[PDB]
């Protein structure tokens, strides 16, 4: 059409934005904006992030040498020695993969349920004053601008100061 | 890739208008907002306008409020200055430039080649 789009997740994510991950824009007469949800966001990048860190497990070992690097080595005991190592190399190997795209699968997993429990939040919040939209969005049925916007976002909407104006609205 | 090429340079004489134009390729045109910028000749960078959410909000700076008017056209790709009431201290060269946020522009990212503008007896 002539001016862009407001649709949320369903359909695609927000491609412009840089405060946190989680997040939600309004639209109203006023104008529109932007904001970001602070405490969810710390919560889901401090359980994410320091996955790194619990891979390397400081159980140390003061390995040393077996194989001298200037070798005079036999020939049996030196084949023997090759093929422990390479059986451990291909355990590491075949090991270190499939810990890492198991983890993955979780991180993947986990983060979009942590986006639905968000989306849940405010359904149940809304009560009987908001209708689905199906793309990820509520239609709002009363005229509610900018503090208000606000107060969604902030767990003090009361909605029993509107639910005899939104109520009036769904069902004509 | 990423491209801005820009069009609309001319001459004009007071109370007349220009109508500059800047388009955009190689990017979600509704992902980011616009900004026009302007240099004058050997002196400082003057902050003009931007637009914000889609095209549904607009800012101006002080030194043109109630001047200009920006807008934007989706089905097109196109940016858009209708001037006003053009004086002398407008002659300038002209900029259409891409930031990386949506509701506030915070900071531009990419330029185009930019035209010139001058004004006459």
């Known amino acids: 059409g002539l001016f862009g789009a407001i649709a949320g997740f369903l359909e695609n994510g927000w491609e412009g934005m840089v405060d946190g991950w989680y997040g939600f824009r309004h639209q109203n007469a006023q104008g529109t904006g932007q904001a970001a949800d602070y405490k969810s966001t710390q919560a889901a990048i401090d359980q994410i992030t320091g996955k790194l860190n619990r891979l390397v497990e400081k159980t140390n070992t003061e390995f040393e040498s077996i194989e001298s690097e200037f070798s005079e080595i036999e020939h049996q005991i030196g084949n023997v020695i090759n093929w422990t190592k390479d059986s451990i190399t291909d355990i590491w190997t075949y090991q270190a993969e499939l810990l890492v795209a198991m983890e993955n699968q979780h991180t993947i997993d986990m983060a979009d349920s942590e986006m639905l429990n968000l989306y849940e939040r405010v359904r149940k919040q809304l009560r009987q004053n908001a209708e689905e939209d199906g793309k990820g969005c509520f239609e709002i049925y009363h005229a509610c601008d900018d503090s208000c916007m606000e107060s969604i976002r902030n767990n003090t909407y009361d909605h029993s100061q509107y639910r005899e104006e939104a109520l009036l609205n769904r069902l004509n | 890739e990423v491209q801005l090429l820009e069009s609309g340079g001319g001459l004009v004489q007071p109370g007349g208008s220009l109508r500059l134009s800047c388009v955009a390729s190689?990017?979600?045109?509704?992902?980011?907002?616009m900004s026009w910028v302007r240099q004058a000749p050997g002196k400082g960078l003057e902050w003009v306008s931007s637009v914000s959410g889609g095209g549904y909000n607009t800012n101006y700076a002080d030194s043109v409020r109630g001047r200009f008017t920006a807008s934007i056209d989706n089905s097109k790709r196109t940016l858009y200055l209708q001037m006003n009431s053009l004086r002398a201290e407008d002659t300038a060269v002209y900029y259409c430039?891409?930031?990386?946020?949506?509701?506030?522009?915070?900071?531009?990212?990419?330029w185009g080649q930019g035209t010139l503008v001058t004004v006459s007896s």
């Open positions: 190689g990017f979600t045109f509704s992902a980011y907002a």
């Open positions: 430039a891409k930031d990386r946020n949506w509701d506030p522009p915070y900071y531009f990212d990419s």
